Design a protein around this ligand. Structure first.
Ligand SMILES: [K+]
Ligand SMILES: [K+]
Ligand SMILES: [K+]
Ligand SMILES: [Mg+2]
Ligand SMILES: [Mg+2]
Ligand SMILES: [Mg+2]
Ligand SMILES: [Mg+2]
Ligand SMILES: [Mg+2]
Ligand SMILES: [Mg+2]
Ligand SMILES: [Mg+2]
Ligand SMILES: [Mg+2]
Ligand SMILES: [Mg+2]
Ligand SMILES: [Mg+2]
Ligand SMILES: [Mg+2]
Ligand SMILES: [Mg+2]
Ligand SMILES: [Mg+2]
Ligand SMILES: [Mg+2]
Lengths: 48, 77, 52, 92, 272
RNA sequence: CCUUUACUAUAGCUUUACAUUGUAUUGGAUACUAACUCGCGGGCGAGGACAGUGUAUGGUGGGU
RNA sequence: GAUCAGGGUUAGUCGGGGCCUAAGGAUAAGCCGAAUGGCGAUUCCGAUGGAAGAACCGGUUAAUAUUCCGGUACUGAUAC
RNA sequence: CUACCCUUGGUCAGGUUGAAGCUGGAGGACCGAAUCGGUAAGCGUUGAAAAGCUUUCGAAUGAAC
């Protein structure tokens, strides 16, 4: 059967990528929380 | 910006109060409108966004002194 | 609203005089045309002169 | 520092054994074909006639510890250089 | 002016379509058409504000000249064309100087006629004149509300209005709805009726034709749940109470014209 | 969570008063144009102290 | 198709990209709004579409092949 | 993922019938593969599968996929 995750690299970066996070105040708020935690992976732009 | 340019007046936050004393948040808005003015000293026209209270000051001390007073306190910018 | 009539005006008149009008009559008709000027102390002193 | 090292492999030795003017180097991954022709000609003093290129990403080398410590070798670019017919190069 | 289909299939049994007999050309003018984008009833925020809109055939928009400003320059009717954007037909005009335009096709206007606009133009079918220069009792369409703005009223297929009286700076006009109101005499109108009067005799025949026209199925309120509609709920079929909309607006006589609109000064008799 | 002629509120709609808001004739109407509003083209039209808006106020208000 | 090491992907034309615009997105002048901001062009971005620049058959390696070699073509720049 | 919508692309073996205008070739027309579904029965129920398989069945030029 068709499952929930059907990958598309173009969709992934448009929805969760680094440049989309930086485009809004609430996205930059997410980046600040992940930096303060010390995450090695900041966005999906890192795993690529 | 919904601010008067002569007085600086802006909306204030208050309550609606019913007869049972239920209190709900409300806004008291400014009687704010746009009006065109003839400026005798400069021989021109200007359009200001002022309250009815600002118009009262204009009609007491004159337009020219009102703009000078408004620019000192930082209302016209 | 106190104004200085710089011209002879229908009904209320006798130019160069102290007259009181409603704020709408002065701000919107007399001043924009140029038959009156607002009466401030800094303008009523310039009218205390008559030298006639 | 364009040229990193020549290529001495089984495939390249056979290629040279057929085309005597054909050699292959490892070069910086961000160098273009025009630059590479300049470097091989300014160091071996030859007439380069044609350059072909390919880009290799490095091989991943995932070890295990307490697991999945990823590793990777540096990426490189391969340049296959053809000299003017009648010229050679000696790596010794 | 219509064509009734024979009952070969249950979907064709009750279908009636137009004969397309007034049409003289098959394709539109290149300089007067542009591709037209579809809304699904969504506004600029992306939310669906109007239901039951969606799908249908791709359509190009045609530039219709509702102002008729080329006053004094004669024009000639070249072709009569199909237009998917409106219920009436349209006519292509070549002006004597090189301009081209589309106008709503009046009933009785045919290829090879000459049309004109202006105050010094003959009151003939397809001519645009100010109401001041239009005789009393005439049949007219494409009525301006303001001078210089452009035709707004009486434009649908088969529609017409009659100029009944003159009142100085205003005329009196009876509208298709039965309302009687005063119009400014410097406005403009076109003589005649709007054509394609047999457009109201068509029957789609099947649900599929509605979808070609861009309409989506419409659900009754009594077959929903109370959370979706005030008329919903109940064990078995229920009436749903007083007819009202999703926001609770009475649907059986509530008047919605603003009772202090200024145009009420010009409305002499009302039917709407 | 849902319903309503349960209670108490409330968005919205609607009434009047004050402000915006003036002038004549004869209060309350009629009339005007300069506040204010809309259209054309790049001033001319059409309205007009109404309308719209702020504050206060009565009514309505399972839409919430 | 596991562990370790070595090796292996070759383009003027192929597929992209460089050019163009759709839905939509970001904006300019402006408009709106406790703040954070919301809107807003003929502007820009954005292919799943349009390009007036152009290649096809065969053979060779353990692993590449309109890319290497053979044969036969085509398309831009540039100098005389 | 799913519901609906917008822009831009693609797909639908074979046979039959015979509307408007002997010819003609329409249709939310017929039979039937691909395909989209999911009628009935059997099986599975620490399953091969957190919804399937086999047989059977519906639609298959359209409100289609
Ligand atoms: K229904
Ligand atoms: K409800
Ligand atoms: K289904
Ligand atoms: Mg080559
Ligand atoms: Mg390459
Ligand atoms: Mg039900
Ligand atoms: Mg019952
Ligand atoms: Mg409740
Ligand atoms: Mg191995
Ligand atoms: Mg190409
Ligand atoms: Mg562009
Ligand atoms: Mg292979
Ligand atoms: Mg080949
Ligand atoms: Mg069928
Ligand atoms: Mg099948
Ligand atoms: Mg059937
Ligand atoms: Mg079938």
């Amino acid at each position: 059967m068709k499952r929930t995750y059907q990958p598309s690299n173009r969709k992934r970066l448009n929805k969760h990528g680094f440049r989309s996070r930086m485009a809004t105040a609430n996205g930059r708020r997410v980046l600040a929380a992940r930096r303060a935690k010390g995450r090695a992976k900041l966005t999906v732009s890192d795993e690529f | 910006s919904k601010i008067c340019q002569i007085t600086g007046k802006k909306a204030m936050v208050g309550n609606n109060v019913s007869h049972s004393k239920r209190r709900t948040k409300r806004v008291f808005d400014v009687n704010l409108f746009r009006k065109k003015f003839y400026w005798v000293e400069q021989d021109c026209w200007v359009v200001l966004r002022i309250s009815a209270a600002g118009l009262r000051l204009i009609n007491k001390i004159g337009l020219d002194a009102a703009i000078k007073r408004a620019a000192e306190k930082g209302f016209l910018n | 609203m106190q104004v200085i009539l710089k011209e002879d005006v229908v009904n209320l008149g006798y130019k160069d005089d102290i007259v009181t009008v409603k704020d709408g009559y002065g701000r919107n008709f007399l001043i924009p045309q140029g038959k009156a000027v607002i009466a401030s102390e800094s303008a009523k002193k310039v009218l205390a002169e008559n030298l006639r | 520092g364009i040229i990193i090292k020549p290529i001495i492999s089984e495939k390249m030795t056979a290629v040279t054994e057929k085309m005597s003017e054909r050699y292959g180097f490892r070069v910086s991954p961000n160098a273009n074909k025009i630059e590479i022709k300049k470097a091989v000609e300014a160091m071996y003093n030859v007439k380069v006639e044609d350059v072909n290129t390919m880009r290799y990403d490095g091989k991943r080398k995932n070890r295990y510890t307490s697991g999945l410590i990823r590793g990777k070798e540096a990426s490189f670019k391969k340049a296959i250089v053809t000299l003017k017919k009648g010229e050679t190069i000696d790596f010794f | 002016g219509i064509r009734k289909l024979k009952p070969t299939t249950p979907g064709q049994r009750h279908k009636v379509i137009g004969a397309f007999d007034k049409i003289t050309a098959s394709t539109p003018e290149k300089s007067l058409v542009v591709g037209k984008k579809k809304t699904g009833g969504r506004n600029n925020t992306g939310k669906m504000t109007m239901r039951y809109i969606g799908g249908g055939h791709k359509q190009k928009y045609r530039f219709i000249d509702f102002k008729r400003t080329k006053d004094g320059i004669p024009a000639t009717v070249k072709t009569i064309e199909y237009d998917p954007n409106r219920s009436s037909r349209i006519a292509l005009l070549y002006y004597a100087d090189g301009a081209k335009a589309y106008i709503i096709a009046p009933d009785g206007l045919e290829v090879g006629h000459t049309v004109m606009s202006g105050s010094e133009a003959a009151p003939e079918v397809g001519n645009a004149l100010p109401l001041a220069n239009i005789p009393v009792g005439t049949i007219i369409h494409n009525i301006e509300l303001r001078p210089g703005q452009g035709a707004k009223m009486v434009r649908s297929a088969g529609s017409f209005a009659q100029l009944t009286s003159r009142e100085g700076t205003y005329v009196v006009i009876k509208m298709p709805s039965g309302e009687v109101r005063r119009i400014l005499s410097t406005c403009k109108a076109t003589i005649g009726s709007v054509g394609n009067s047999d457009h109201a005799l068509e029957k789609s025949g099947k649900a599929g034709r509605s979808r070609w026209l861009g309409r989506r199925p419409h659900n009754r309120g009594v077959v929903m749940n109370p959370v979706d509609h005030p008329m919903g709920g109940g064990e078995g079929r229920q009436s749903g109470g007083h007819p009202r909309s999703r926001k609770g607006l009475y649907a059986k006589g509530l008047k919605t014209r603003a009772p202090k609109k200024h145009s009420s000064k010009y409305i002499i008799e009302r039917r709407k």
